[PDB]
């Protein structure tokens, strides 16, 4: 019942997916804690610095970059769910209503800037240009753009809601753990949603010397297990997607 393993979550659905998972855990005999963050830094900077022994909070594309950027010497411990990222807007509730010439607002964080590229894409609103590298979209790339829409990516993924709810630009992208949080249901409340989120799972990170840790592997087990992943799905109605790799 009883080995320690401390995880860094944002607070929902992560650490709310934690907390529920303790209970089998401490079944393997692993006692499961939780320390909660509200941003997108602290989580990895807690990691390397031993505050916490795993995250969970962050996508491939985003871990990457903040590896390269920082010299984090962390590993992947395994996917455990996808988070179809929305666009939304009090004032406008289609893209195709948004007036020419409208900012999109988007968070600084550029490994989602793809995101919104292929949302306004398969909106037919944007195009990128021939030969471009779609893994690393940026604004630049974009090719046809029917609105001229123009992009506003100055502000950290926290405070995305707080300028939908200000009504700052056209249309907002908003990481689904925050507008969750908020009370906003991605099914159903966002303008325009990612269909295709796969390269986006979010997933457990360790430090390098922790890749083989065995409470690492039972914990990654318990929440890819059936009856956890049925939980998620029920408990946030689809906007939270259980992945199995
Ligand atoms: C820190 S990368 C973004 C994480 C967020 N939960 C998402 O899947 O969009």
Same mark, same amino acid.
Do not use: C
């Given at each position: 019942?009883?080995?320690?393993?401390?995880?860094?979550?944002?607070?929902?659905?992560?650490?709310?997916?934690?907390?529920?998972?303790?209970?089998?855990?401490?079944?393997?005999?692993?006692?499961?804690?939780?320390?909660?963050?509200?941003?997108?830094?602290?989580?990895?900077?807690?990691?390397?610095?031993?505050?916490?022994?795993?995250?969970?909070?962050?996508?491939?594309?985003?871990?990457?970059?903040?590896?390269?950027?920082?010299?984090?010497?962390?590993?992947?411990?395994?996917?455990?769910?996808?988070?179809?990222?929305?666009?939304?807007?009090?004032?406008?509730?289609?893209?195709?209503?948004?007036?020419?010439?409208?900012?999109?607002?988007?968070?600084?964080? %550029?490994?989602?800037?793809?995101? +919104? @590229?292929?949302?306004? /894409?398969?909106?037919?609103? *944007? !195009?990128? $240009?021939?030969?471009?590298?779609?893994?690393?979209?940026?604004?630049?790339?974009?090719?046809?753009?029917?609105?001229?829409?123009?992009?506003?990516?100055?502000?950290?993924?926290?405070?995305?809601?707080?300028?939908?709810?200000?009504?700052?630009?056209?249309?907002?992208?908003?990481?689904?753990?925050?507008?969750?949080?908020?009370?906003?249901?991605?099914?159903?409340?966002?303008?325009?949603?990612?269909?295709?989120?796969?390269?986006?799972?979010?997933?457990?990170?360790?430090?390098?010397?922790?890749?083989?840790?065995?409470? %690492?592997?039972?914990?990654?087990? +318990? @929440?890819?297990?059936? /009856?956890?992943?049925?939980? *998620? !799905?029920? $408990?946030?109605?689809?906007?939270?997607?259980?992945?199995?790799?």
């Amino acid at each position: 019942d009883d080995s320690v393993l401390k995880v860094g979550a944002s607070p929902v659905p992560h650490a709310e997916i934690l907390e529920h998972v303790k209970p089998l855990l401490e079944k393997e005999g692993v006692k499961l804690e939780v320390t909660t963050y509200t941003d997108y830094v602290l989580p990895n900077k807690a990691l390397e610095s031993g505050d916490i022994d795993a995250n969970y909070f962050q996508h491939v594309p985003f871990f990457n970059e903040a590896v390269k950027e920082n010299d984090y010497d962390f590993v992947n411990a395994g996917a455990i769910h996808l988070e179809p990222v929305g666009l939304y807007s009090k004032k406008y509730k289609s893209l195709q209503e948004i007036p020419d010439g409208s900012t999109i607002y988007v968070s600084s964080s %550029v490994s989602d800037w793809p995101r +919104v @590229l292929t949302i306004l /894409e398969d909106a037919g609103l *944007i !195009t990128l $240009k021939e030969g471009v590298d779609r893994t690393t979209a940026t604004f630049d790339d974009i090719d046809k753009n029917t609105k001229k829409l123009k992009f506003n990516h100055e502000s950290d993924p926290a405070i995305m809601t707080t300028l939908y709810d200000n009504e700052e630009g056209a249309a907002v992208l908003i990481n689904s753990n925050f507008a969750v949080d908020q009370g906003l249901n991605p099914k159903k409340d966002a303008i325009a949603l990612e269909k295709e989120s796969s390269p986006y799972a979010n997933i457990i990170a360790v430090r390098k010397e922790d890749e083989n840790n065995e409470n %690492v592997k039972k914990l990654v087990k +318990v @929440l890819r297990s059936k /009856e956890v992943q049925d939980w *998620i !799905t029920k $408990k946030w109605n689809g906007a939270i997607v259980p992945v199995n790799e």
